[PDB]
Each structure stands twice: as C-alpha cells, then as structure tokens.
Amino acid sequence: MNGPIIMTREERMKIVHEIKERILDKYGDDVKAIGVYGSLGRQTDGPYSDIEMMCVMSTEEAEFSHEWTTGEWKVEVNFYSEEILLDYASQVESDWPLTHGQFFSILPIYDSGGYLEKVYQTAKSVEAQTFHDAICALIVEELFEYAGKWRNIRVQGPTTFLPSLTVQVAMAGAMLIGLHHRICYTTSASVLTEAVKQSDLPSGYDHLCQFVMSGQLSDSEKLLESLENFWNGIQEWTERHGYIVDVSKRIPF
Amino acid sequence: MNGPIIMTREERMKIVHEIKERILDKYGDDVKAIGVYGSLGRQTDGPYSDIEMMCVMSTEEAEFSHEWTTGEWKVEVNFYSEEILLDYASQVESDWPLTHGQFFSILPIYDSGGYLEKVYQTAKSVEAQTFHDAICALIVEELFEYAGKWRNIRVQGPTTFLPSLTVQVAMAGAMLIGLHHRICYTTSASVLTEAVKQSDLPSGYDHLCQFVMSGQLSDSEKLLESLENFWNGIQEWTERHGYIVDVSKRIPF
Numbered sequence: 001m002n003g004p005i006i007m008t009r010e011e012r013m014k015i016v017h018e019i020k021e022r023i024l025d026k027y028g029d030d031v032k033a034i035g036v037y038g039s040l041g042r043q044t045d046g047p048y049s050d051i052e053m054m055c056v057m058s059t060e061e062a063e064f065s066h067e068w069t070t071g072e073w074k075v076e077v078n079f080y081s082e083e084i085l086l087d088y089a090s091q092v093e094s095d096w097p098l099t100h101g102q103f104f105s106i107l108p109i110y111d112s113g114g115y116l117e118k119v120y121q122t123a124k125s126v127e128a129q130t131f132h133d134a135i136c137a138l139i140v141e142e143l144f145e146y147a148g149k150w151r152n153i154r155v156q157g158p159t160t161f162l163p164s165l166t167v168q169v170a171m172a173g174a175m176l177i178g179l180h181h182r183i184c185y186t187t188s189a190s191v192l193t194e195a196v197k198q199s200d201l202p203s204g205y206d207h208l209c210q211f212v213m214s215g216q217l218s219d220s221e222k223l224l225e226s227l228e229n230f231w232n233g234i235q236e237w238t239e240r241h242g243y244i245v246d247v248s249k250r251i252p253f
Numbered sequence: 254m255n256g257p258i259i260m261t262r263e264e265r266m267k268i269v270h271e272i273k274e275r276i277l278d279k280y281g282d283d284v285k286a287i288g289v290y291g292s293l294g295r296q297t298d299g300p301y302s303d304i305e306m307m308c309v310m311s312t313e314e315a316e317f318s319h320e321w322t323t324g325e326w327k328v329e330v331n332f333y334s335e336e337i338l339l340d341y342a343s344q345v346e347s348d349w350p351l352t353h354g355q356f357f358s359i360l361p362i363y364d365s366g367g368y369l370e371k372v373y374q375t376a377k378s379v380e381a382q383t384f385h386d387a388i389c390a391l392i393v394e395e396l397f398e399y400a401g402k403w404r405n406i407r408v409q410g411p412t413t414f415l416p417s418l419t420v421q422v423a424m425a426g427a428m429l430i431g432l433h434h435r436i437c438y439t440t441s442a443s444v445l446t447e448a449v450k451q452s453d454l455p456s457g458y459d460h461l462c463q464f465v466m467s468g469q470l471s472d473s474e475k476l477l478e479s480l481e482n483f484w485n486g487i488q489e490w491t492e493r494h495g496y497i498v499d500v501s502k503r504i505p506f
C-alpha cells in the first residue's frame with residue numbers, strides 16, 4: 001500500500017461520523033456512548049494522523065475492538081462494557097502516563113447518559129497509593145532489569161543493543177516521572193519532551209534524554225555511564241521521595 | 254540499591270533450588286512442574302543476568318506471579334494452571350518471536366508428568382495460518398501506524414522522537430521476519446542481529462537496522478528516507494508472500 005494519506009480534520013471527522021452511524025445501525029440500544037480520543041479528540045490531529053475511537057456498550061463482558069485500513073487511512077474502534085472500561089480507567093500501571101491520557105482527551109460524539117464524564121472522573125480519581133505501588137513495581141520489574149542487561153553489555157556485549165536499550169530506559173524514566181507527578185503525556189512523541197520538563201527529575205535523567213533525543217546514541221562508552229549515573233540519580237530520588245522497594249525478603253513468598 | 258551484581262550459574266542455580274523448595278513446601282501436590290527459562294535455562298547466562306522460573310499447577314484459577322529483588326538480585330516466578338498456560342503456548346501475537354522462545358528454552362527442574370513437554374509440543378504445534386494472520390495484524394495495527402507518525406514527523410515534528418521511533422519500527426519489522434520464519438529470538442539483545450541474518454528480508458530492513466544497531470540515529474533526513482524504503486520493501490514482500498489484507502471496505506463491520 002501507499003500508506004497514510006494527508007487528510008484534514010474535516011475529512012477525519014466525516015469518517016468519525018460515518019462510523020458512528022454504523023455503530024448505531026448495528027448495535028442500536030446496546031450503545032451507551034461513543035467517543036474520539038487521541039490527536040483528533042484533542043483536535044491537534046496532524047496530516048498523517050489516525051482515528052481512534054472508543055465505544056461504550058450496554059452489553060456485559062463486552063470487550064472488543066475493530067482496527068482497519070483502506071490503504072489510505074487507518075481506524076481503530078474499541079468497544080467496552082461500562083464496567084470493563086471503568087475498571088480499566090482505574091488502573092495505574094507502568095505505562096499509565098502513556099496509556100491513560102486517552103481518558104482526559106475524549107471528544108464526545110454520542111452519550112446516552114454521561115457515560116463519558118463518568119469515565120473521565122474515574123480516571124481522574126486515582127488514589128495516591130496506587131501510583132506509589134506502580135513506581136515500586138516499575139523499579140523491580142523494569143529499571144532493575146535494564147540495569148542488568150546494560151551491565152552485561154559492558155562486560156560481554158553487544159553494544160548493538162545499547163542504542164535500543166537506552167531508548168527503553170529513557171522511556172522508563174519518563175513513565176516514572178509521570179506516575180510520580182500524576183501526569184499523562186499528550187502523545188507518544190511528546191513523551192520525552194514533556195518528561196524532561198517536570199520538576200523533581202532524577203539525577204542523570206535529562207542528560208540521558210539528550211542522547212536519546214538527539215539521536216547521537218553511537219558512543220557506547222558515554223551511554224554506559226549515563227545509564228549508570230541515571231540509575232544512581234534514581235536510587236537517591238526514590239529514597240527522598242519515599243518509593244522504597246522491599247528488598248529484605250530472599251523469598252517473598 | 255546496588256543493582257544487579259555479579260553472579261554465576263552456581264549462585265543462580267542455588268536459588269533456583271531454594272525457590273524450588275518453597276514452592277514444593279508451599280504448594281506441594283498442587284505443583285505439577287517447575288522449570289527454568291531465560292539465559293539461565295539455556296545456560297547462556299551472564300554475570301549480571303536474572304532468574305526466570307515458571308511453574309505449572311493443578312489449580313484451575315491459576316495465573317499469578319512473584320517478582321522481586323533483594324537489592325542485588327532479581328527473581329521471577331510464573332504460576333499457571335496447565336490449561337491456561339498451554340493455551341498461551343499456542344498464542345501467536347505480533348511479539349510471539351520475542352516471547353515464545355520461552356516455551357522452547359526450558360530447563361526442567363521438576364516435573365510430575367512431562368507437562369513441560371506438552372507445553373513444548375504445544376508451542377511448536379502452532380498453525381501457519383495463525384502466523385499468517387499475525388503478520389497481517391502487525392502491518393495494520395502497527396506498521397501502518399508507524400508510517401503516518403514518521404510522516405507527520407517529516408512535516409510537523411518532532412525529530413526528538415525520530416530516533417526512538419526508528420527503533421520501534423526496527424523491532425517490529427523483526428517481529429515480522431520471525432513470524433515469517435517461525436523464528437523466536439533467544440533474547441531481547443539478539444533480536445536485531447539475528448533477524449538481519451534471515452533470508453527473505455523485506456527490501457530496506459538491513460540498512461535500517463544498521464542505523465539502530467550502530468546508534469547513528471542523528472541523521473533525520475536519512476532516516477525517514479530509509480524508513481520509507483522499508484515501507485515500500487514491505488509493500489512488495491507481502492505481495493510476494495501473500496500477506497495481503499482486503500482494503501475494499503471503508504467500514505469493515
């Protein structure tokens with residue numbers, strides 16, 4: 001295929017409406033509400049942008065999505081039960097700052113009873129603890145691991161992975177930041193640029209983002225240290241912020 | 254937190270057994286099989302490598318875990334009811350090649366009745382169609398998606414995401430090859446190197462990987478330009494292999 005074509009918000013929107021009409025002809029009374037999320041729902045959609053949408057079903061245990069292309073453009077429509085969506089909107093995870101911005105950006109197209117605010121609010125009312133736990137997990141389950149792989153790279157190679165790991169790591173810290181600050185990033189592309197602006201940034205972070213953002217990830221000696229510094233900027237940050245991981249137990253269970 | 258320290262197979266293996274015991278004292282007869290995977294499992298383990306285990310159980314409602322650190326080390330145990338896991342062994346996703354290697358790389362430490370083979374038989378007893386659909390989905394849900402992005406980037410930005418995007422693309426096309434060649438990667442760091450060793454490469458990938466593996470991601474113009482070609486490489490390749498998706502319908506449902 002020729003890939004994604006240039007379109008206009010106006011064109012995009014007609015599609016939105018076309019699809020909306022189809023959802024209702026098909027499900028009818030089973031449809032509770034329909035929304036536009038992403039760049040479009042934000043009204044910041046670019047020329048090559050896609051259309052993501054989310055639909056709220058009456059129908060229980062409902063969880064499906066329909067994603068397609070016409071060669072020229074692509075669409076994605078997710079359908080959920082009113083429950084399934086709420087629960088989901090209530091989940092803070094390692095990529096929450098990436099995933100959950102979708103709940104504060106909905107562009108309502110059809111609501112039979114304010115389902116869309118409900119959603120938003122729910123997303124909006126997350127307990128602080130939840131975010132803490134999520135930072136903690138992210139460290140054990142993620143940062144730690146990368147730490148290992150990068151220390152082995154030094155040791156036994158390969159550095160052909162170094163450029164890719166760094167990015168992963170650059171990202172990881174950003175989710176770290178966001179979970180900390182209860183922020184969701186605009187898009188996936190604004191992630192680095194927005195993370196590097198926040199306040200209580202771990203020592204070594206910005207410097208790493210430098211590398212990752214400039215594209216100069218060719219010198220593995222340097223990249224090695226940054227990761228190193230960052231990790232240390234982290235051990236600290238955690239202490240001072242209270243996200244202290246339980247190391248104690250050799251056998252957690 | 255000192256982060257992963259230097260270990261040896263002996264050390265590792267020592268914990269594995271200790272772990273092996275808690276599980277046995279802890280779940281006893283509900284434990285059908287305990288095994289080891291990862292770098293350890295193959296014994297390709299390194300100084301700073303981690304521990305991955307997996308245990309099968311008779312319990313119906315089984316699908317839980319335990320990941321932890323002590324400050325210098327990480328362990329990761331996965332519990333599953335044989336049904337669930339088997340089921341998962343035969344699940345081909347866009348990332349099956351990164352992921353499914355686990356089902357092959359097993360190091361059996363305990364097994365009441367060859368469950369660890371069933372799982373292996375199962376993982377390798379997956380249908381070509383299944384992989385055929387995997388490919389189609391990637392392209393749409395992903396490839397096509399990355400295409401607009403790098404496009405929009407060419408027109409509005411931002412370049413600070415170019416590097417990172419490119420890595421994403423490279424990973425994915427790699428997924429493509431594996432799914433193409435019922436291949437699985439040993440590990441994460443070997444993905445690329447290994448992938449580019451394949452035959453039927455889509456026109457463009459190799460070059461593209463060279464930038465990612467090298468870290469010479471500073472050149473914008475040169476990237477987008479190496480990405481587009483890749484895209485076109487795809488367009489051809491799929492037509493050659495028959496990874497063809499029907500784009501006739503504007504609204505396919």
Ligand SMILES: NC[C@H]1O[C@H](O[C@H]2[C@H](O)[C@@H](O[C@H]3O[C@H](CO)[C@@H](O)[C@H](N)[C@H]3O)[C@H](N)C[C@@H]2N)[C@H](O)[C@@H](O)[C@@H]1O
Pocket residue numbers: 093094095096141142145320329
């Ligand atoms: N063996 C597979 C890996 O599975 C889990 O890892 C974590 C996932 O990766 C996380 O996902 C995050 O990181 C991904 C890249 O890994 C990104 O794509 C994603 N956007 C991020 O949110 C997810 N949220 C939690 C989960 N614990 C294990 O814990 C880890 O030990 C292991 O290595």
Ligand SMILES: NC[C@H]1O[C@H](O[C@H]2[C@H](O)[C@@H](O[C@H]3O[C@H](CO)[C@@H](O)[C@H](N)[C@H]3O)[C@H](N)C[C@@H]2N)[C@H](O)[C@@H](O)[C@@H]1O
Pocket residue numbers: 067076346347348351394395398421
């Ligand atoms: N907006 C989020 C995206 O959600 C789905 O996309 C897909 C996920 O992204 C995939 O995950 C891949 O990307 C991860 C992150 O890099 C990698 O860790 C992983 N190895 C990859 O397989 C997953 N396997 C299938 C799923 N359909 C939508 O289809 C797509 O429209 C949208 O863009």
Ligand SMILES: Nc1ncnc2c1ncn2[C@@H]1O[C@H](COP(=O)(O)CP(=O)(O)OP(=O)(O)O)[C@@H](O)[C@H]1O
Pocket residue numbers: 037038039040044045046048049050052098099100101102103186187188398402405
């Ligand atoms: N795994 C995931 N990755 C990225 N975004 C995710 C996501 N889970 C949820 N989201 C949300 O869903 C949206 C997905 O749209 P994307 O296709 O990633 C690009 P976009 O940010 O909408 O802008 P664009 O269309 O102009 O490129 C994100 O903006 C984000 O709010």
Ligand SMILES: Nc1ncnc2c1ncn2[C@@H]1O[C@H](COP(=O)(O)CP(=O)(O)OP(=O)(O)O)[C@@H](O)[C@H]1O
Pocket residue numbers: 148149152290291292293297298299301302303305351352353354355358438439440441
């Ligand atoms: N997202 C994912 N990333 C990496 N491996 C994944 C994975 N999902 C499943 N796996 C599988 O589970 C294993 C866990 O791998 P990791 O813990 O990330 C490092 P490793 O491949 O064991 O080598 P290493 O520890 O010496 O660096 C992998 O070898 C892979 O086969």
Ligand SMILES: [Mg+2]
Pocket residue numbers: 037038039040049050051052
């Ligand atoms: Mg979008």
Ligand SMILES: [Mg+2]
Pocket residue numbers: 291292293302303304305
């Ligand atoms: Mg490992």
